Design a protein around this ligand. Structure first.
Ligand code: KIF
Ligand code: CA
Length: 738
């Protein structure tokens, strides 16, 4: 049974700076591939490296880029051509169309109109096989671009080989950073020239220069297939040569199929049925996107043991290592999806995190490949703890604990988004002041508070001294310190203790991060009852939640000086202030469950699943962000969501398919049966879990792992009585102390 047929790698590529519909590129790769490959439409250096609207392809690129904002490293490209041998990235470019293009997660094909050449490629974790089909011609060449900012290239004719290294990067790299690559052709060169800063140097074997390049060529007869075996490494040329064995002796088709099996082996852990083709495509495309980042950043040694170039100190060290994720996005539901469906993969990730801390002094927040200055919060604490509480345990709990503590009282000296910016204020005043020139201070405060709740949880589980437990228990309630009784919202707070004036809840940025108070106020994943309590009780809380959907999408962009795409994205949806396009509010709807109106969540979640996700190139309503916006759909379509990582709970929403089946790593399975599900039947009239009636609005990790069957009675009417009792509510820190 093949699920790859549903995956559309182009979903997200019809995106512009002014309005995101995903901001993705076609990532032709294995699951968590160390090296992704992609057609390249944009010019070198542009974060929009492939846009669906582009007329021309200028190369086939090894890329690691996690987003057009973070940009790229370890990047070089290859491009077959005919006619004059040109290195220029514009002159070598060829028209193409999508009806002449085939994109799968394991295989990519395209017809380059102006060269009359077909290109195909199938990657492994670290290597890729290209096959170029050339027309009849005296002058057929292949261009190899090592990119600029200091690269290297050497042609080695007596082995039909080219080698090189690329360094162009967007920060986050040690001084010795290099991506080492090798390229073997199966046809001898009849022409060879290296390129040096735009200059063609025929029969000059090698260059070390700003922008190194190489062009090789030959005579071709009609339909002649030239294959290139490619691999790279962050360690060395000798390791790059070892990586090339990934390719075995396979040709395109045999590799494609091993690639397709690899993907089916992971997509197939979740089988959905009983929906339309749109839904299958949207679901499995989203699932695929959730299985890409963070990337493997280790390589296999001669004995098949994991080793890695540290992007933190530049040494080569044994053990796991991953990168290219921003925890500010991915703590929310992406890493949780991994603890549920792929625990053994996140095991390697956590081992990796431990290695990051040993090698750099901090657990990372945004990493690409080393520490990068981007976003806010200390949400690594949530990643680390949620894993552990879910049975994904690192070997060195001692180091784990120390690293957590370390980041609660240090910010990284060159990367302000690593450790906690403004911890001093936060540890003393219980919040980050609005007026001390630390932006996004209210956002930092609410996340730090949650992050401390997680640490509290781990302190507790580990039998730490009551004094560490208590200190984090207290800090966990730090969200109270920004709550404004009048507006019933969170609000920037001055160093002296007075709230900032004037206050606009519609202002984006400033106190908050790419959102406004209406988006950020809900960031109390560990204690919604505490937030209800703050607002005056469930009814008022509900009244506030409704407003988010009902108010016009007015805004205040002064902080940014332009209508950034996250704002635009929100405005166009006609969903009030509900900005699903950005991470901070993405859990909000499930909150209804906590106030005893689960039917409202069910309504709104289906509106989102139905309207805000489509399977085409313009598929998302905002940035995808490395699994987060996608895993959201995956979770929601199954019918529940990790509102609060660190707990063992998944908060109930409403399933999208008539039947979904989870195959867990432990050999057990779980069938979620919604036989009456339909376009109109989105309310849950009742549930049962293995014959036992289930009224609660949450599911426990441990129970799901046991397997069996959950039955969902779908209906078009809201059941005003199910899920309203105190015992039906998911976890809030305020409750407890019990
Ligand atoms: O301008 C940016 N938009 C996105 C953010 O919204 C955030 O989701 C990403 O982690 C982060 C990195 O992609 N981003 C930016 O820097
Ligand atoms: Ca975003």
């Amino acid at each position: 049974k093949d699920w790859t047929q549903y995956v559309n790698p182009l979903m997200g590529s019809q995106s512009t700076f002014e309005l995101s519909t995903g901001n993705t590129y076609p990532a032709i790769a294995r699951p968590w591939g160390m090296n992704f490959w992609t057609p390249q439409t944009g010019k070198m250096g542009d974060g929009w490296q492939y846009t669906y609207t582009a007329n021309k392809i200028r190369g086939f690129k090894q890329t690691h880029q996690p987003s057009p904002w973070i940009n790229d490293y370890g990047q070089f490209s290859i491009m077959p051509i005919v006619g004059q041998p040109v290195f220029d990235e514009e002159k070598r470019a060829s028209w193409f169309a999508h009806k002449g293009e085939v994109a799968t997660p394991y295989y990519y094909k395209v017809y380059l109109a102006e060269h009359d050449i077909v290109t195909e490629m199938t990657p492994t974790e670290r290597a890729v096989l290209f096959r170029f089909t050339f027309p009849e011609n005296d002058h057929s060449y292949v261009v190899v671009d090592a990119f600029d900012k200091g690269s290297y290239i050497k042609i080695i004719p007596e082995e039909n080989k080219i080698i090189g290294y690329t360094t162009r990067n967007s920060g986050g790299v040690p001084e010795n950073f290099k991506n080492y690559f090798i390229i073997e052709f199966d046809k001898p060169f009849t022409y060879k020239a290296t390129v040096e800063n735009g200059n063609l140097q025929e029969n000059v074997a090698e260059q070390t220069t700003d922008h190194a390049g190489a062009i090789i060529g030959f005579k071709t007869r009609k339909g002649e297939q030239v294959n290139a075996r490619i691999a790279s490494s962050f360690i060395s040329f000798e390791q790059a040569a070892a990586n090339m064995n990934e390719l075995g002796k396979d040709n395109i088709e045999q590799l494609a199929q091993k690639g397709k099996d690899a993907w089916n082996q992971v997509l197939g852990k979740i089988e959905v049925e009983g929906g339309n083709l749109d839904q299958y495509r949207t679901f499995y495309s989203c699932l695929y996107r959730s299985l890409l980042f963070p990337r493997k950043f280790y390589e296999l040694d001669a004995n098949g043991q994991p080793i890695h170039y540290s992007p933190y100190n530049g040494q080569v060290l044994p053990g796991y290592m991953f990168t290219d994720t921003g925890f500010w996005d991915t703590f929310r539901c992406l890493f949780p999806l991994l603890n549920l469906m792929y625990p053994s993969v996140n095991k390697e990730m956590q081992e990796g995190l431990i290695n990051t801390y040993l090698e750099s002094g901090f657990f990372p927040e945004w990493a690409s490949p080393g520490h990068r200055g981007c976003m806010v919060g200390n949400n690594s604490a949530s990643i680390l703890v949620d894993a552990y509480m879910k049975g994904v345990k690192v070997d060195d709990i001692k180091t784990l604990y120390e690293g957590l503590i370390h980041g609660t009282e240090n910010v990284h000296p060159e990367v302000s988004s690593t450790g906690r910016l403004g911890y001093e204020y936060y540890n003393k005043l219980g919040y980050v002041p609005y007026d001390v020139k630390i932006n996004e201070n209210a956002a930092r405060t609410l996340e730090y508070a949650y992050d401390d709740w997680c640490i509290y949880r781990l302190a507790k589980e580990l039998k730490r001294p009551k004094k560490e437990i208590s200190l984090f228990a207290k800090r966990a309630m730090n969200y109270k310190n920004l709550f404004d009784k009048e507006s019933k919202l969170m609000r920037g707070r001055n160093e002296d203790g007075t709230f900032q004036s004037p206050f606009s809840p519609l202002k984006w940025g400033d106190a908050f991060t790419e959102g406004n108070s209406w988006h950020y106020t809900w960031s109390v994943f560990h204690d919604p009852q505490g937030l209800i309590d703050l607002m005056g009780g469930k009814e008022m809380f509900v009244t506030m939640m409704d407003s988010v959907f009902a108010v016009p999408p007015i805004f205040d962009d002064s902080y940014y000086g332009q209508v950034i795409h996250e704002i635009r994205e929100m405005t166009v949806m006609n969903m009030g202030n509900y900005a699903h396009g950005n991470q901070p509010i993405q859990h909000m709807i499930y909150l209804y469950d906590y106030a005893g109106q689960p039917w409202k969540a069910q309504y709104w979640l289906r509106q989102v699943m139905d309207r805000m996700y489509t399977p085409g190139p313009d598929g998302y309503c905002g940035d995808e962000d490395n699994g987060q916006t996608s895993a959201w759909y995956v979770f929601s379509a199954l019918g529940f969501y990790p509102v609060c990582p660190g707990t063992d709970e998944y908060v109930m929403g409403t399933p999208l398919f008539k039947k979904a089946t989870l195959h867990f790593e432990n050999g057990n399975s779980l069938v979620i049966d919604a036989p009456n599900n339909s376009t109109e039947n989105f309310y849950i009239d009742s549930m049962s879990f293995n014959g036992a009636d289930h009224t609660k609005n949450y599911l426990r990790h441990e129970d799901l792992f046991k397997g069996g069957t959950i039955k969902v009675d779908m209906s078009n009417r809201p059941n005003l009585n199910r899920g309203t009792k105190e015992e039906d509510m998911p976890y809030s820190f305020s409750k407890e102390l019990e």
